[PDB]
Amino acid sequence: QKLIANQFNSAIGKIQDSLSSTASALGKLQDVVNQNAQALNTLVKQLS
Amino acid sequence: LVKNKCVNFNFNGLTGTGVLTESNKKFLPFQQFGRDIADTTDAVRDPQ
Numbered sequence A: 001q002k003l004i005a006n007q008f009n010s011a012i013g014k015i016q017d018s019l020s021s022t023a024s025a026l027g028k029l030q031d032v033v034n035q036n037a038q039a040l041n042t043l044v045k046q047l048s
Numbered sequence B: 001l002v003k004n005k006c007v008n009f010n011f012n013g014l015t016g017t018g019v020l021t022e023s024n025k026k027f028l029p030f031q032q033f034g035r036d037i038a039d040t041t042d043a044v045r046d047p048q
Ligand SMILES: *[C@@H]1O[C@H](CO)[C@@H](O)[C@H](O)[C@H]1NC(C)=O
Pocket: B047, B048
């Protein structure tokens, strides 16, 4: 039991550190916002 | 000019409607108009 407990705690710490350090992991969420912003910007720019 | 009221302004050939407000935050060295990301006027300087 102690071995699995320690491994799980270490894994949680590792994933927290990975999220804190790297910044390109959340592309699947940023690209949607970027696409919507580009669509709205193009629609507005079509006025001219 | 009348401020904080929805008017139909006309500044040196530019038209439109809006709520003119004090905008001391913006600093303009010699430029006349203002503009935004989507190419829209957000600030003007009073000719008088
Ligand atoms: C315009 O005339 C008014 C009249 O007193 C004066 O206060 C103002 O400084 C003048 N501004 C310019 C740019 O000539």
